[PDB]
Design an enzyme around this catalytic site. Structure first.
Site, PDB file in Angstrom:
ATOM      1  N   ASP A 186       0.295  51.854  29.675  1.00  0.00           N
ATOM      2  CA  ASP A 186       1.755  51.783  29.784  1.00  0.00           C
ATOM      3  C   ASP A 186       2.131  50.786  30.895  1.00  0.00           C
ATOM      4  OD1 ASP A 186       4.505  52.226  29.991  1.00  0.00           O
ATOM      5  OD2 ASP A 186       4.342  54.342  30.464  1.00  0.00           O
ATOM      6  N   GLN A 227       4.452  32.145  34.567  1.00  0.00           N
ATOM      7  CA  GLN A 227       4.885  31.056  35.439  1.00  0.00           C
ATOM      8  C   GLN A 227       5.726  31.580  36.593  1.00  0.00           C
ATOM      9  OE1 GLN A 227       6.887  26.573  35.265  1.00  0.00           O
ATOM     10  NE2 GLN A 227       7.027  27.946  33.483  1.00  0.00           N
ATOM     11  N   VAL A 265       6.633  47.710  22.221  1.00  0.00           N
ATOM     12  CA  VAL A 265       5.516  47.956  21.329  1.00  0.00           C
ATOM     13  C   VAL A 265       4.218  47.399  21.912  1.00  0.00           C
ATOM     14  CG1 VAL A 265       4.560  47.625  19.008  1.00  0.00           C
ATOM     15  CG2 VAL A 265       7.059  47.839  19.330  1.00  0.00           C
TER      16      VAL A 265
END
Ligand SMILES: [Ca+2]
Length: 319
Positions: free
Chosen positions: A302, A87, A295
């Protein structure tokens, strides 16, 4: 070094449920501000209502505009580079639309420009309560969650407004009210232009999406999905980050509502805006912001490096 040193300050803008730091402890943009700053970037992290519409006097857009002005004052800068997640990308568009002179670029990450089939779903579920009391009870719980987790205990939380804002029907209205050259035609699954110019103001427009959740089998009118961010079943991300399986679950509802590939709550088509850098990242919605706590599945790129490389791209582009 100065790899991420952009001319204009970068303001990271959070989405739904957000704040700069949950309970003043967990950074929404996990490890991103520090990484960028270490590479020479001037970064500010917005703290807006976690639950609200983007337009309106009490909306997130006016809150972000006010914040942009304080950042410009503090740095002496004349414009900012807005980078919004979910958003936050819609909030960033509001600021670029109402104050073009204060913005140099808008980058949206997993932003539901066309809304979310999952928001449509949640709204519909609430409508099945004949008494309507759940709308009141659940909205109250969620609003309280927002006030308690907001780093500044911001009392301006309106869960029902936030839910309505993210629906596909409402997002279409938002796009009519706040048009952008970076948006393609509704229903076309196309992006628009890489820039927008109003008067003497030019904005560099960008976006990327996570498409970890892929529809992979259809049986008896039911579509099954696969979370491509993970090594099937055995991936430690399914154990160490509860949002991995949660987003695969919501992503399954998404594909059964005709969304196509998605990040759990935002479809690839809904995320398209400006120069689409990539829609191939095997990321779920939270992987996009290096969550939870860094995680991500084994096949997921990445996100810290992707955001950093983008700061450099902005630098090279002159902003
Ligand atoms: Ca994750």
């Amino acid at each position: 070094d100065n790899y991420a040193a952009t001319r204009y300050p970068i303001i990271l803008v959070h989405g739904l449920t957000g704040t700069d730091k949950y309970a003043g402890v967990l950074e929404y943009w996990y490890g991103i501000q520090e990484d960028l700053q270490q590479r020479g970037a001037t970064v500010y992290v917005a703290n807006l209502s976690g639950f609200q519409s983007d337009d309106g006097p009490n909306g997130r857009g006016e809150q972000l505009l006010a914040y942009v002005k304080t950042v410009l004052a503090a740095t002496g800068a004349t414009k900012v580079n807005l980078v919004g997640h979910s958003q936050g990308g819609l909030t960033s568009r509001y600021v670029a639309a109402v104050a073009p002179d204060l913005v140099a670029s808008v980058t949206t990450i997993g932003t539901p420009h066309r809304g979310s089939e999952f928001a449509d779903f949640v709204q519909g579920v609430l409508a099945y309560d004949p008494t309507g009391l759940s709308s009141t009870v659940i909205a109250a719980f969620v609003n309280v969650f927002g006030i308690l987790t907001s780093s500044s205990n911001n009392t301006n939380q309106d869960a029902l407004a936030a839910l309505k804002t993210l629906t596909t029907a409402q997002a279409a209205t938002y796009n009519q009210n706040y048009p952008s050259a970076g948006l393609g035609a509704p229903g076309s699954c196309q992006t628009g232009a890489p820039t927008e110019t109003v008067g003497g103001n030019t904005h560099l427009l960008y976006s990327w999406a996570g498409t970890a959740i892929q529809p992979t089998i259809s049986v008896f009118g039911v579509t099954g999905a696969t979370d491509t961010s993970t090594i099937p079943l055995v991936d430690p991300a399914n154990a160490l980050d509860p949002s991995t399986l949660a987003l695969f679950g919501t992503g399954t509802v998404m594909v059964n509502r005709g969304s196509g590939q998605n990040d759990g709550v935002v479809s690839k088509c809904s995320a398209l805006y400006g120069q689409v850098l990539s829609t191939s990242y095997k990321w779920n919605h939270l992987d996009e912001i290096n969550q939870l706590l860094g995680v991500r599945g084994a096949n997921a790129e990445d996100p810290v490096a992707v955001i950093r490389t983008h700061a450099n791209r902005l630098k090279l582009a002159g902003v």
